[PDB]
Amino acid sequence: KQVRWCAISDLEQKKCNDLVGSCNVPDITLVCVLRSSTEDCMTAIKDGQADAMFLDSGEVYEASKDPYNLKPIIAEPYSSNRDLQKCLKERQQALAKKMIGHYIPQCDEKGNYQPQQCHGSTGHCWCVNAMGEKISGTNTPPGQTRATCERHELPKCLKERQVAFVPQCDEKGNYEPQQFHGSTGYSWCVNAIGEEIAGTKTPPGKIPATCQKHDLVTTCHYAVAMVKKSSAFQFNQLKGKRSCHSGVSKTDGWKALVTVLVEKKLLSWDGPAKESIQRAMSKFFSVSCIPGATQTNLCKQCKGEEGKNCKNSHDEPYYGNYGAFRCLKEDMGDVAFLRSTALSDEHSEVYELLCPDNTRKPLNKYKECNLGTVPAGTVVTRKISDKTEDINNFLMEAQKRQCKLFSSAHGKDLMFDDSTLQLALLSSEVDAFLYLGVKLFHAMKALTGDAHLPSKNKVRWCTINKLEKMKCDDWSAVSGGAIACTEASCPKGCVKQILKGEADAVKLEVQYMYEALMCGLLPAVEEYHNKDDFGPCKTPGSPITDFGTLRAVALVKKSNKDINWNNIKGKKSCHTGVGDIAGWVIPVSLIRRQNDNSDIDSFFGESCAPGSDTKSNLCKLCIGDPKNSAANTKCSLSDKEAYYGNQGAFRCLVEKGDVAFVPHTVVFENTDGKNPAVWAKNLKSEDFELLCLDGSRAPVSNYKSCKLSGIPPPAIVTREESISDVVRIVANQQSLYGRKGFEKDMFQLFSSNKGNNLLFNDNTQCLITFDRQPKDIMEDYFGKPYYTTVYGASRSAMSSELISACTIKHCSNSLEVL
Ligand SMILES: NC(=O)OC[C@@H]1N=C(N)N2CCC(O)(O)[C@@]23N=C(N)N[C@@H]13
Ligand SMILES: C[As](C)(=O)[O-]
Ligand SMILES: C[As](C)(=O)[O-]
Ligand SMILES: C[As](C)(=O)[O-]
């Protein structure tokens, strides 16, 4: 097997061939393909001439589009997970330097930093926090009483909980995004470290601002503007100056600067629709070196010879952060835009930093004087990912064998950023959007000029299969411009489309709502399913007696008078299926919050929960159908498991188990002769009962009171800015095509000939506008009992790539005392 790495320059080719000769990965052969620039390597990968390369984050979005169509696959984790056992990696890397007397970080058995660190060759010791950051002032020489280093095993929120406001924390001890004051009614949002965001203070009785989840990144890199102390201009006087940039497509040399110039209104630019960003920048600076730029004056200062001048390549001596520094040093520019990785103390004598507040500060003040944070780059390959396995196996084996991937005598930041500690395989789900995150993806999209201009009068409805797409096309065809259709492969894909600005609304079952609410989407309308009362549909806003929701109940046989909610442990159970809300989510959530987290084996006896491990206690009661009893078909999440679903779990209770976990309708749907099957033909609803949380039992008609939990209705989600419009247009369309629509003979919102339950559940009576209450949206939508039961009333109850991409990563301020 081969992995063709694409190099952009002679120096990168030399490092790549050094790795070819020195790094022995069995069964995988490294091959180096040479191109003249970053973009020519991207093209070679697109064409199948190379396999992988490393890209700046500022390039990921552009790389994901024509004419490249590349995706991130392998990268260093840009989150607080970069610090999980980081001591071990820094220890391996320091020992890899093979320098005599060099300081080697000391870790414990778990891989964490020892609170006291020592430089063995000098006898000096100091204290570090759990992140490996030096506590200020704790360095002592040998022979002197040492500073006492504290373990500080509790997080900041849990340590503030020791003090007696009341900062609600999650289970890991981190701050909750939403903070609510108990004495008053004011609620606000915090920033992972426990500091309030401006604009989130909401008085009681007002709709609270939805808080985004935050994650603290320890070691951050920043885009800075470096100048000489000999000059005297300020940031507001940049127009007409000569500049050196690391690269036209890099965040540390272009995109952060462009963002700041637009925000400060220093750059005359009418937007990407009227003028390219490069065109506007070429009239802002007079003669610059900006590798890759297509404006000639932005290449005049570059030093490369014929054919190499202004190339995105180390063949251009002014390319990259150190090349832009060389350009500034050799006086070919008045300012250099570069990443803070190229700052050093040796440069603090001659050079300083130009800050966007029109001041100048020392180099050590880069956290206080920068143009934004720079996320880590990433290895990319073709979207079709035919070589991802090979690239990953090669890189992981090379890291395990400690090959010199992240350093070279030929130069700095060749092939990879030298600051890379460890590369890890990304999930195949990760694309440019998930890698950059919501805000950054949108900013890159807007800078490129692909930003969708919103329409207040049209709703782009997202579909999850071809039949939904056909039904939506019908709807759009009779909608008079009010409805358009987009296509995705699953509800999460639609949620992503909405977050990216490619769609506007989608219906989501409860399973998907947590994620959706985590990412800042809100319910516009909800499916109303009460078939006995059309009032709230005919007269929108009229009072509601029952929304038609399903209630999750624990059904028993009345004869077995020994089953109570307290002695459920050990009894035989019946479930509709793993993942189902009434059949699985709510029962197991209640059990785990009342006993120890142990549903597999350590609670029930023999059960039949389809989809579980075939050789487990939760699969003994399951029986397949004798139509093909040769195959197992036991615990199959399908019709072949006779105990799968509502009728399945009821049959399980009938023939095997003691208690069934089902929606309240199952016993009524299957008893009283309403089921023509052989079983339940003589079954009565009065022959069963339901278990209550207080240990009591109640008749099957008491499901509204004696229930395990309520279940929220399916919700149509959209972005906040679209709520009104969506609520309006749906309403209009309902009055046309709902169950009593004026033109119901032309189209039906809640039925179709193309299939069943497309876009909405066919049993939907209508869609009712969500009435937002002055509370947290998680509680407001789920109901406080459901929220508290299945998510602990916490924003940290689930992890996913989407939730990560919706999590804001941010950096500290300056000092590291404690
Ligand atoms: N009729 C009814 O059942 O309420 C419908 C609507 N839908 C929810 N999922 N909710 C969560 C709890 C809740 O109060 O029932 C509600 N919260 C608001 N703001 N309106 C409700
Ligand atoms: C806690 As000690 C004496 O190993 O620094
Ligand atoms: C053994 As010592 C004085 O370097 O902690
Ligand atoms: C400025 As480019 C997308 O050709 O690297």
PDB file of N, CA, C and O in Angstrom, residues 327-388:
ATOM      1  N   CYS A 327      10.461  38.954   5.472  1.00  0.00           N
ATOM      2  CA  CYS A 327      10.055  40.072   4.627  1.00  0.00           C
ATOM      3  C   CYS A 327      10.005  41.371   5.420  1.00  0.00           C
ATOM      4  O   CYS A 327      10.479  42.411   4.949  1.00  0.00           O
ATOM      5  N   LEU A 328       9.442  41.328   6.631  1.00  0.00           N
ATOM      6  CA  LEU A 328       9.433  42.520   7.480  1.00  0.00           C
ATOM      7  C   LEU A 328      10.845  42.909   7.915  1.00  0.00           C
ATOM      8  O   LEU A 328      11.183  44.099   7.962  1.00  0.00           O
ATOM      9  N   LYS A 329      11.676  41.918   8.239  1.00  0.00           N
ATOM     10  CA  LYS A 329      13.023  42.180   8.737  1.00  0.00           C
ATOM     11  C   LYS A 329      13.891  42.833   7.672  1.00  0.00           C
ATOM     12  O   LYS A 329      14.628  43.785   7.956  1.00  0.00           O
ATOM     13  N   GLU A 330      13.808  42.343   6.435  1.00  0.00           N
ATOM     14  CA  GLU A 330      14.551  42.894   5.312  1.00  0.00           C
ATOM     15  C   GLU A 330      13.915  44.163   4.751  1.00  0.00           C
ATOM     16  O   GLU A 330      14.266  44.583   3.641  1.00  0.00           O
ATOM     17  N   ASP A 331      12.987  44.762   5.500  1.00  0.00           N
ATOM     18  CA  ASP A 331      12.393  46.064   5.205  1.00  0.00           C
ATOM     19  C   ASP A 331      11.604  46.079   3.902  1.00  0.00           C
ATOM     20  O   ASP A 331      11.314  47.150   3.360  1.00  0.00           O
ATOM     21  N   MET A 332      11.234  44.910   3.388  1.00  0.00           N
ATOM     22  CA  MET A 332      10.354  44.850   2.229  1.00  0.00           C
ATOM     23  C   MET A 332       8.893  45.087   2.594  1.00  0.00           C
ATOM     24  O   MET A 332       8.043  45.123   1.698  1.00  0.00           O
ATOM     25  N   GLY A 333       8.585  45.246   3.878  1.00  0.00           N
ATOM     26  CA  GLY A 333       7.247  45.605   4.301  1.00  0.00           C
ATOM     27  C   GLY A 333       7.306  46.374   5.603  1.00  0.00           C
ATOM     28  O   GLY A 333       8.276  46.279   6.360  1.00  0.00           O
ATOM     29  N   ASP A 334       6.252  47.151   5.854  1.00  0.00           N
ATOM     30  CA  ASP A 334       6.143  47.927   7.082  1.00  0.00           C
ATOM     31  C   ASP A 334       5.463  47.158   8.204  1.00  0.00           C
ATOM     32  O   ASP A 334       5.502  47.601   9.358  1.00  0.00           O
ATOM     33  N   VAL A 335       4.844  46.020   7.889  1.00  0.00           N
ATOM     34  CA  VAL A 335       4.082  45.243   8.855  1.00  0.00           C
ATOM     35  C   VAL A 335       4.020  43.818   8.328  1.00  0.00           C
ATOM     36  O   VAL A 335       3.999  43.592   7.116  1.00  0.00           O
ATOM     37  N   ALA A 336       4.018  42.851   9.244  1.00  0.00           N
ATOM     38  CA  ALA A 336       3.915  41.442   8.891  1.00  0.00           C
ATOM     39  C   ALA A 336       2.737  40.829   9.634  1.00  0.00           C
ATOM     40  O   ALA A 336       2.639  40.952  10.855  1.00  0.00           O
ATOM     41  N   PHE A 337       1.844  40.179   8.904  1.00  0.00           N
ATOM     42  CA  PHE A 337       0.710  39.488   9.500  1.00  0.00           C
ATOM     43  C   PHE A 337       1.034  38.001   9.571  1.00  0.00           C
ATOM     44  O   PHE A 337       1.248  37.357   8.535  1.00  0.00           O
ATOM     45  N   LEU A 338       1.094  37.467  10.792  1.00  0.00           N
ATOM     46  CA  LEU A 338       1.614  36.119  10.980  1.00  0.00           C
ATOM     47  C   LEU A 338       1.060  35.513  12.262  1.00  0.00           C
ATOM     48  O   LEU A 338       0.472  36.196  13.102  1.00  0.00           O
ATOM     49  N   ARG A 339       1.280  34.210  12.410  1.00  0.00           N
ATOM     50  CA  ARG A 339       0.852  33.488  13.598  1.00  0.00           C
ATOM     51  C   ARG A 339       1.827  33.721  14.746  1.00  0.00           C
ATOM     52  O   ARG A 339       3.034  33.871  14.543  1.00  0.00           O
ATOM     53  N   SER A 340       1.289  33.741  15.967  1.00  0.00           N
ATOM     54  CA  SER A 340       2.108  34.001  17.146  1.00  0.00           C
ATOM     55  C   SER A 340       3.170  32.935  17.391  1.00  0.00           C
ATOM     56  O   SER A 340       4.028  33.137  18.256  1.00  0.00           O
ATOM     57  N   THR A 341       3.147  31.822  16.654  1.00  0.00           N
ATOM     58  CA  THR A 341       4.183  30.807  16.816  1.00  0.00           C
ATOM     59  C   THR A 341       5.555  31.304  16.383  1.00  0.00           C
ATOM     60  O   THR A 341       6.566  30.751  16.828  1.00  0.00           O
ATOM     61  N   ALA A 342       5.619  32.324  15.532  1.00  0.00           N
ATOM     62  CA  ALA A 342       6.895  32.846  15.064  1.00  0.00           C
ATOM     63  C   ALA A 342       7.434  33.971  15.938  1.00  0.00           C
ATOM     64  O   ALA A 342       8.506  34.507  15.641  1.00  0.00           O
ATOM     65  N   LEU A 343       6.724  34.339  17.002  1.00  0.00           N
ATOM     66  CA  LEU A 343       7.228  35.317  17.956  1.00  0.00           C
ATOM     67  C   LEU A 343       8.240  34.669  18.893  1.00  0.00           C
ATOM     68  O   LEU A 343       8.087  33.511  19.290  1.00  0.00           O
ATOM     69  N   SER A 344       9.279  35.426  19.246  1.00  0.00           N
ATOM     70  CA  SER A 344      10.287  34.962  20.191  1.00  0.00           C
ATOM     71  C   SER A 344      10.785  36.148  21.005  1.00  0.00           C
ATOM     72  O   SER A 344      10.544  37.309  20.664  1.00  0.00           O
ATOM     73  N   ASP A 345      11.492  35.840  22.095  1.00  0.00           N
ATOM     74  CA  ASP A 345      12.042  36.900  22.935  1.00  0.00           C
ATOM     75  C   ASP A 345      13.198  37.617  22.250  1.00  0.00           C
ATOM     76  O   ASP A 345      13.381  38.825  22.452  1.00  0.00           O
ATOM     77  N   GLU A 346      13.973  36.903  21.430  1.00  0.00           N
ATOM     78  CA  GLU A 346      15.059  37.530  20.684  1.00  0.00           C
ATOM     79  C   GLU A 346      14.566  38.642  19.770  1.00  0.00           C
ATOM     80  O   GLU A 346      15.352  39.519  19.398  1.00  0.00           O
ATOM     81  N   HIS A 347      13.286  38.625  19.402  1.00  0.00           N
ATOM     82  CA  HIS A 347      12.701  39.655  18.559  1.00  0.00           C
ATOM     83  C   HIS A 347      12.073  40.792  19.352  1.00  0.00           C
ATOM     84  O   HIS A 347      11.701  41.807  18.755  1.00  0.00           O
ATOM     85  N   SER A 348      11.947  40.654  20.674  1.00  0.00           N
ATOM     86  CA  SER A 348      11.300  41.697  21.464  1.00  0.00           C
ATOM     87  C   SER A 348      12.142  42.962  21.576  1.00  0.00           C
ATOM     88  O   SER A 348      11.626  43.990  22.028  1.00  0.00           O
ATOM     89  N   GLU A 349      13.414  42.914  21.176  1.00  0.00           N
ATOM     90  CA  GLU A 349      14.242  44.115  21.191  1.00  0.00           C
ATOM     91  C   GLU A 349      13.870  45.051  20.049  1.00  0.00           C
ATOM     92  O   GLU A 349      13.658  46.252  20.257  1.00  0.00           O
ATOM     93  N   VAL A 350      13.775  44.514  18.834  1.00  0.00           N
ATOM     94  CA  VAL A 350      13.552  45.336  17.652  1.00  0.00           C
ATOM     95  C   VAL A 350      12.071  45.460  17.296  1.00  0.00           C
ATOM     96  O   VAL A 350      11.653  46.480  16.737  1.00  0.00           O
ATOM     97  N   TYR A 351      11.260  44.457  17.623  1.00  0.00           N
ATOM     98  CA  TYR A 351       9.906  44.356  17.100  1.00  0.00           C
ATOM     99  C   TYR A 351       8.869  44.443  18.211  1.00  0.00           C
ATOM    100  O   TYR A 351       9.124  44.071  19.362  1.00  0.00           O
ATOM    101  N   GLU A 352       7.687  44.939  17.840  1.00  0.00           N
ATOM    102  CA  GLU A 352       6.535  45.046  18.723  1.00  0.00           C
ATOM    103  C   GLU A 352       5.291  44.636  17.939  1.00  0.00           C
ATOM    104  O   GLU A 352       5.369  44.245  16.769  1.00  0.00           O
ATOM    105  N   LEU A 353       4.130  44.734  18.581  1.00  0.00           N
ATOM    106  CA  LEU A 353       2.872  44.280  18.011  1.00  0.00           C
ATOM    107  C   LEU A 353       1.926  45.460  17.852  1.00  0.00           C
ATOM    108  O   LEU A 353       1.767  46.268  18.776  1.00  0.00           O
ATOM    109  N   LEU A 354       1.309  45.546  16.677  1.00  0.00           N
ATOM    110  CA  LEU A 354       0.329  46.573  16.355  1.00  0.00           C
ATOM    111  C   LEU A 354      -1.058  46.054  16.717  1.00  0.00           C
ATOM    112  O   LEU A 354      -1.515  45.056  16.150  1.00  0.00           O
ATOM    113  N   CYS A 355      -1.729  46.725  17.660  1.00  0.00           N
ATOM    114  CA  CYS A 355      -2.994  46.193  18.132  1.00  0.00           C
ATOM    115  C   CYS A 355      -4.161  46.893  17.450  1.00  0.00           C
ATOM    116  O   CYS A 355      -4.072  48.074  17.105  1.00  0.00           O
ATOM    117  N   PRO A 356      -5.275  46.180  17.255  1.00  0.00           N
ATOM    118  CA  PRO A 356      -6.422  46.781  16.555  1.00  0.00           C
ATOM    119  C   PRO A 356      -7.046  47.961  17.283  1.00  0.00           C
ATOM    120  O   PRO A 356      -7.844  48.682  16.670  1.00  0.00           O
ATOM    121  N   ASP A 357      -6.719  48.184  18.558  1.00  0.00           N
ATOM    122  CA  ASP A 357      -7.203  49.358  19.276  1.00  0.00           C
ATOM    123  C   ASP A 357      -6.332  50.588  19.043  1.00  0.00           C
ATOM    124  O   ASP A 357      -6.436  51.558  19.805  1.00  0.00           O
ATOM    125  N   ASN A 358      -5.473  50.541  18.021  1.00  0.00           N
ATOM    126  CA  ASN A 358      -4.629  51.664  17.607  1.00  0.00           C
ATOM    127  C   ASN A 358      -3.533  51.958  18.633  1.00  0.00           C
ATOM    128  O   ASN A 358      -3.182  53.114  18.871  1.00  0.00           O
ATOM    129  N   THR A 359      -2.981  50.905  19.236  1.00  0.00           N
ATOM    130  CA  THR A 359      -1.844  51.014  20.143  1.00  0.00           C
ATOM    131  C   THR A 359      -0.762  50.029  19.711  1.00  0.00           C
ATOM    132  O   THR A 359      -0.937  49.245  18.775  1.00  0.00           O
ATOM    133  N   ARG A 360       0.371  50.076  20.401  1.00  0.00           N
ATOM    134  CA  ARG A 360       1.463  49.143  20.174  1.00  0.00           C
ATOM    135  C   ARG A 360       1.887  48.553  21.509  1.00  0.00           C
ATOM    136  O   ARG A 360       2.005  49.273  22.505  1.00  0.00           O
ATOM    137  N   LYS A 361       2.103  47.245  21.529  1.00  0.00           N
ATOM    138  CA  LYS A 361       2.427  46.527  22.750  1.00  0.00           C
ATOM    139  C   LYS A 361       3.622  45.618  22.517  1.00  0.00           C
ATOM    140  O   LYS A 361       3.998  45.357  21.371  1.00  0.00           O
ATOM    141  N   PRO A 362       4.267  45.151  23.584  1.00  0.00           N
ATOM    142  CA  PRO A 362       5.379  44.207  23.417  1.00  0.00           C
ATOM    143  C   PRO A 362       4.902  42.875  22.856  1.00  0.00           C
ATOM    144  O   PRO A 362       3.709  42.573  22.794  1.00  0.00           O
ATOM    145  N   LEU A 363       5.880  42.065  22.440  1.00  0.00           N
ATOM    146  CA  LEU A 363       5.578  40.754  21.868  1.00  0.00           C
ATOM    147  C   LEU A 363       4.904  39.841  22.886  1.00  0.00           C
ATOM    148  O   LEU A 363       4.011  39.060  22.534  1.00  0.00           O
ATOM    149  N   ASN A 364       5.322  39.916  24.151  1.00  0.00           N
ATOM    150  CA  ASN A 364       4.751  39.066  25.190  1.00  0.00           C
ATOM    151  C   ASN A 364       3.287  39.371  25.467  1.00  0.00           C
ATOM    152  O   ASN A 364       2.643  38.611  26.197  1.00  0.00           O
ATOM    153  N   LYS A 365       2.748  40.457  24.912  1.00  0.00           N
ATOM    154  CA  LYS A 365       1.350  40.822  25.097  1.00  0.00           C
ATOM    155  C   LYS A 365       0.471  40.341  23.948  1.00  0.00           C
ATOM    156  O   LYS A 365      -0.533  40.984  23.623  1.00  0.00           O
ATOM    157  N   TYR A 366       0.823  39.208  23.330  1.00  0.00           N
ATOM    158  CA  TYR A 366       0.114  38.781  22.127  1.00  0.00           C
ATOM    159  C   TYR A 366      -1.318  38.355  22.425  1.00  0.00           C
ATOM    160  O   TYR A 366      -2.200  38.531  21.576  1.00  0.00           O
ATOM    161  N   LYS A 367      -1.578  37.803  23.616  1.00  0.00           N
ATOM    162  CA  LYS A 367      -2.947  37.457  23.987  1.00  0.00           C
ATOM    163  C   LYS A 367      -3.826  38.692  24.155  1.00  0.00           C
ATOM    164  O   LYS A 367      -5.051  38.591  24.030  1.00  0.00           O
ATOM    165  N   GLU A 368      -3.223  39.846  24.424  1.00  0.00           N
ATOM    166  CA  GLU A 368      -3.925  41.108  24.596  1.00  0.00           C
ATOM    167  C   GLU A 368      -3.890  41.970  23.339  1.00  0.00           C
ATOM    168  O   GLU A 368      -4.510  43.038  23.311  1.00  0.00           O
ATOM    169  N   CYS A 369      -3.193  41.519  22.288  1.00  0.00           N
ATOM    170  CA  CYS A 369      -2.895  42.347  21.118  1.00  0.00           C
ATOM    171  C   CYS A 369      -2.796  41.420  19.901  1.00  0.00           C
ATOM    172  O   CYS A 369      -1.712  41.024  19.466  1.00  0.00           O
ATOM    173  N   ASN A 370      -3.954  41.069  19.344  1.00  0.00           N
ATOM    174  CA  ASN A 370      -4.014  40.119  18.243  1.00  0.00           C
ATOM    175  C   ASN A 370      -5.253  40.399  17.403  1.00  0.00           C
ATOM    176  O   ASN A 370      -6.037  41.307  17.694  1.00  0.00           O
ATOM    177  N   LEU A 371      -5.429  39.593  16.355  1.00  0.00           N
ATOM    178  CA  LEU A 371      -6.538  39.740  15.421  1.00  0.00           C
ATOM    179  C   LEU A 371      -7.473  38.536  15.444  1.00  0.00           C
ATOM    180  O   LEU A 371      -8.257  38.346  14.510  1.00  0.00           O
ATOM    181  N   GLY A 372      -7.404  37.717  16.486  1.00  0.00           N
ATOM    182  CA  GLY A 372      -8.243  36.542  16.613  1.00  0.00           C
ATOM    183  C   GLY A 372      -7.424  35.286  16.838  1.00  0.00           C
ATOM    184  O   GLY A 372      -6.204  35.259  16.684  1.00  0.00           O
ATOM    185  N   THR A 373      -8.135  34.229  17.216  1.00  0.00           N
ATOM    186  CA  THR A 373      -7.528  32.927  17.442  1.00  0.00           C
ATOM    187  C   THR A 373      -7.395  32.167  16.131  1.00  0.00           C
ATOM    188  O   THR A 373      -8.162  32.370  15.186  1.00  0.00           O
ATOM    189  N   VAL A 374      -6.412  31.276  16.087  1.00  0.00           N
ATOM    190  CA  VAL A 374      -6.143  30.466  14.904  1.00  0.00           C
ATOM    191  C   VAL A 374      -6.333  28.999  15.266  1.00  0.00           C
ATOM    192  O   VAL A 374      -5.514  28.435  16.002  1.00  0.00           O
ATOM    193  N   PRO A 375      -7.391  28.350  14.790  1.00  0.00           N
ATOM    194  CA  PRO A 375      -7.545  26.913  15.039  1.00  0.00           C
ATOM    195  C   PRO A 375      -6.491  26.108  14.293  1.00  0.00           C
ATOM    196  O   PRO A 375      -5.866  26.576  13.340  1.00  0.00           O
ATOM    197  N   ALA A 376      -6.302  24.871  14.746  1.00  0.00           N
ATOM    198  CA  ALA A 376      -5.300  23.992  14.159  1.00  0.00           C
ATOM    199  C   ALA A 376      -5.670  23.604  12.731  1.00  0.00           C
ATOM    200  O   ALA A 376      -6.845  23.536  12.365  1.00  0.00           O
ATOM    201  N   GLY A 377      -4.644  23.352  11.922  1.00  0.00           N
ATOM    202  CA  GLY A 377      -4.832  22.820  10.589  1.00  0.00           C
ATOM    203  C   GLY A 377      -5.231  21.354  10.635  1.00  0.00           C
ATOM    204  O   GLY A 377      -5.449  20.764  11.694  1.00  0.00           O
ATOM    205  N   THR A 378      -5.308  20.746   9.451  1.00  0.00           N
ATOM    206  CA  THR A 378      -5.820  19.384   9.390  1.00  0.00           C
ATOM    207  C   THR A 378      -5.320  18.700   8.128  1.00  0.00           C
ATOM    208  O   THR A 378      -5.117  19.345   7.101  1.00  0.00           O
ATOM    209  N   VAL A 379      -5.097  17.389   8.224  1.00  0.00           N
ATOM    210  CA  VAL A 379      -4.834  16.583   7.042  1.00  0.00           C
ATOM    211  C   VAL A 379      -6.141  16.403   6.288  1.00  0.00           C
ATOM    212  O   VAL A 379      -7.204  16.207   6.890  1.00  0.00           O
ATOM    213  N   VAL A 380      -6.070  16.506   4.966  1.00  0.00           N
ATOM    214  CA  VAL A 380      -7.217  16.354   4.086  1.00  0.00           C
ATOM    215  C   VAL A 380      -6.870  15.343   3.007  1.00  0.00           C
ATOM    216  O   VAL A 380      -5.695  15.124   2.674  1.00  0.00           O
ATOM    217  N   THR A 381      -7.921  14.725   2.473  1.00  0.00           N
ATOM    218  CA  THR A 381      -7.878  13.881   1.289  1.00  0.00           C
ATOM    219  C   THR A 381      -9.179  14.116   0.522  1.00  0.00           C
ATOM    220  O   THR A 381      -9.980  14.986   0.878  1.00  0.00           O
ATOM    221  N   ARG A 382      -9.394  13.331  -0.533  1.00  0.00           N
ATOM    222  CA  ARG A 382     -10.612  13.443  -1.326  1.00  0.00           C
ATOM    223  C   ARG A 382     -11.848  13.164  -0.479  1.00  0.00           C
ATOM    224  O   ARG A 382     -11.821  12.355   0.455  1.00  0.00           O
ATOM    225  N   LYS A 383     -12.951  13.836  -0.832  1.00  0.00           N
ATOM    226  CA  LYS A 383     -14.221  13.586  -0.155  1.00  0.00           C
ATOM    227  C   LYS A 383     -14.611  12.117  -0.227  1.00  0.00           C
ATOM    228  O   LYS A 383     -15.180  11.573   0.723  1.00  0.00           O
ATOM    229  N   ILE A 384     -14.313  11.458  -1.349  1.00  0.00           N
ATOM    230  CA  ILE A 384     -14.682  10.058  -1.504  1.00  0.00           C
ATOM    231  C   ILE A 384     -13.904   9.164  -0.536  1.00  0.00           C
ATOM    232  O   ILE A 384     -14.286   8.008  -0.323  1.00  0.00           O
ATOM    233  N   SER A 385     -12.827   9.683   0.062  1.00  0.00           N
ATOM    234  CA  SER A 385     -12.097   9.037   1.162  1.00  0.00           C
ATOM    235  C   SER A 385     -11.705   7.593   0.839  1.00  0.00           C
ATOM    236  O   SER A 385     -11.828   6.689   1.668  1.00  0.00           O
ATOM    237  N   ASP A 386     -11.200   7.384  -0.376  1.00  0.00           N
ATOM    238  CA  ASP A 386     -10.715   6.064  -0.761  1.00  0.00           C
ATOM    239  C   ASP A 386      -9.401   5.695  -0.082  1.00  0.00           C
ATOM    240  O   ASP A 386      -9.069   4.507  -0.013  1.00  0.00           O
ATOM    241  N   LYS A 387      -8.633   6.673   0.400  1.00  0.00           N
ATOM    242  CA  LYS A 387      -7.321   6.408   0.982  1.00  0.00           C
ATOM    243  C   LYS A 387      -7.248   6.762   2.460  1.00  0.00           C
ATOM    244  O   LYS A 387      -6.154   6.727   3.037  1.00  0.00           O
ATOM    245  N   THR A 388      -8.378   7.099   3.085  1.00  0.00           N
ATOM    246  CA  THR A 388      -8.360   7.552   4.471  1.00  0.00           C
ATOM    247  C   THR A 388      -7.796   6.486   5.404  1.00  0.00           C
ATOM    248  O   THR A 388      -7.003   6.793   6.303  1.00  0.00           O
TER     249      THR A 388
END
